[PDB]
Each structure stands twice: as structure tokens, then as C-alpha cells.
Design a protein around this motif. Structure first.
Motif, PDB file in Angstrom:
ATOM      1  N   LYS A   5     -45.530 -19.721 -23.568  1.00 39.45           N
ATOM      2  CA  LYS A   5     -46.730 -18.252 -23.031  1.00 39.45           C
ATOM      3  C   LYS A   5     -46.146 -16.608 -22.314  1.00 39.45           C
ATOM      4  CE  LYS A   5     -50.554 -19.216 -25.512  1.00 39.45           C
ATOM      5  NZ  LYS A   5     -50.935 -20.795 -25.543  1.00 39.45           N
ATOM      6  N   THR A   6     -46.591 -15.904 -22.531  1.00 34.12           N
ATOM      7  CA  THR A   6     -46.352 -14.241 -21.906  1.00 34.12           C
ATOM      8  C   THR A   6     -47.116 -13.520 -21.189  1.00 34.12           C
ATOM      9  OG1 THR A   6     -45.603 -12.922 -23.406  1.00 34.12           O
ATOM     10  CG2 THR A   6     -44.630 -14.675 -22.702  1.00 34.12           C
ATOM     11  N   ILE A   7     -47.444 -13.105 -20.294  1.00 35.92           N
ATOM     12  CA  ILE A   7     -48.537 -12.514 -19.101  1.00 35.92           C
ATOM     13  C   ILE A   7     -47.495 -10.982 -18.933  1.00 35.92           C
ATOM     14  CG2 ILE A   7     -50.760 -12.116 -18.285  1.00 35.92           C
ATOM     15  CD1 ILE A   7     -49.937 -14.941 -18.223  1.00 35.92           C
ATOM     16  N   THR A   8     -48.997 -10.498 -19.233  1.00 33.03           N
ATOM     17  CA  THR A   8     -48.023  -9.155 -18.036  1.00 33.03           C
ATOM     18  C   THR A   8     -48.977  -8.437 -17.101  1.00 33.03           C
ATOM     19  OG1 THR A   8     -47.970  -7.030 -18.747  1.00 33.03           O
ATOM     20  CG2 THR A   8     -49.688  -7.617 -19.970  1.00 33.03           C
ATOM     21  N   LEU A   9     -48.454  -7.789 -16.422  1.00 32.82           N
ATOM     22  CA  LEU A   9     -49.462  -7.946 -15.363  1.00 32.82           C
ATOM     23  C   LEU A   9     -48.823  -6.440 -14.024  1.00 32.82           C
ATOM     24  CD1 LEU A   9     -51.201  -8.479 -12.921  1.00 32.82           C
ATOM     25  CD2 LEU A   9     -51.252 -10.149 -14.750  1.00 32.82           C
ATOM     26  N   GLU A  10     -49.572  -6.133 -13.085  1.00 39.57           N
ATOM     27  CA  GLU A  10     -48.803  -4.473 -12.749  1.00 39.57           C
ATOM     28  C   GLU A  10     -49.225  -4.618 -11.155  1.00 39.57           C
ATOM     29  OE1 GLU A  10     -51.506  -1.105 -13.937  1.00 39.57           O
ATOM     30  OE2 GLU A  10     -51.046   0.207 -12.332  1.00 39.57           O
ATOM     31  N   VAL A  11     -48.777  -4.464 -10.584  1.00 44.00           N
ATOM     32  CA  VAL A  11     -48.349  -4.079  -8.801  1.00 44.00           C
ATOM     33  C   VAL A  11     -47.323  -2.684  -9.045  1.00 44.00           C
ATOM     34  CG1 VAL A  11     -48.937  -6.031  -7.968  1.00 44.00           C
ATOM     35  CG2 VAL A  11     -47.093  -6.373  -9.947  1.00 44.00           C
ATOM     36  N   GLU A  12     -46.958  -3.105  -7.197  1.00 47.19           N
ATOM     37  CA  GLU A  12     -46.084  -1.853  -6.365  1.00 47.19           C
ATOM     38  C   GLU A  12     -45.163  -2.283  -5.847  1.00 47.19           C
ATOM     39  OE1 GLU A  12     -49.234  -2.731  -5.405  1.00 47.19           O
ATOM     40  OE2 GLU A  12     -50.226  -1.149  -5.212  1.00 47.19           O
ATOM     41  N   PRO A  13     -43.858  -1.749  -5.136  1.00 46.22           N
ATOM     42  CA  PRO A  13     -42.717  -2.151  -5.205  1.00 46.22           C
ATOM     43  C   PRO A  13     -42.606  -2.312  -2.980  1.00 46.22           C
ATOM     44  CG  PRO A  13     -43.205   0.359  -5.057  1.00 46.22           C
ATOM     45  CD  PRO A  13     -43.932  -0.022  -6.177  1.00 46.22           C
TER      46      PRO A  13
END
Length: 77
Positions: free
Chosen positions: A12-20
Motif C-alpha cells: 500500500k502507498t500513501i501520500t502526505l505533506e510536510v515541511e523541511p
């Protein structure tokens, strides 16, 4: 943009968003506030190196479109 992708063991592949400037310690709060799953039985590994609590997103030089492995915790054995 700066989207990331995470792969599991179940294919399973999931996508997420974050900062450096985000820290593995802080990012954990977001996960707990969404699922509340304590990273006590979860072990994150990438590039053969185990993600340490003292490691940062940018500190890991994780570029965009990066793929991280996700381990699972088995109960009984």
C-alpha cells in the motif's frame, strides 16, 4: 510543491505533506491527532538507516517524491 510518498509492507502507498523544518518528534503529534497511533511498535527505516528521534526532515536531505518504508507490528509470537 513538496509532496511525499510512503510505502508499506502490504503493498500500500500513501501520500502526505510536510515541511523541511519539521521534526520527526513534531510530525508525530499530527499523526496522533489523526489516528492516535503511538510510534512505540512502529519503526521507520530509510536508506538502510533507522529514523532517529533526533533526526529532522531537512536534516535527512529528503527530496521531493521520496519513498520511505513502513514496518508493521505483529501481535502474538
Amino acid at each position: 510543491g513538496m509532496q511525499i510518498f510512503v510505502k508499506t509492507l502490504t503493498g500500500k502507498t500513501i501520500t502526505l505533506e510536510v515541511e523541511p523544518s519539521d521534526t520527526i518528534e513534531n510530525v508525530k503529534a499530527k499523526i496522533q491527532d489523526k489516528e492516535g497511533i503511538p510510534p512505540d511498535q512502529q519503526r521507520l527505516i530509510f536508506a538502510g538507516k533507522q529514523l532517529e528521534d533526533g533526526r529532522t526532515l531537512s536534516d535527512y536531505n529528503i527530496q521531493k517524491e521520496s519513498t520511505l518504508h513502513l514496518v508493521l507490528r505483529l501481535r502474538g509470537g
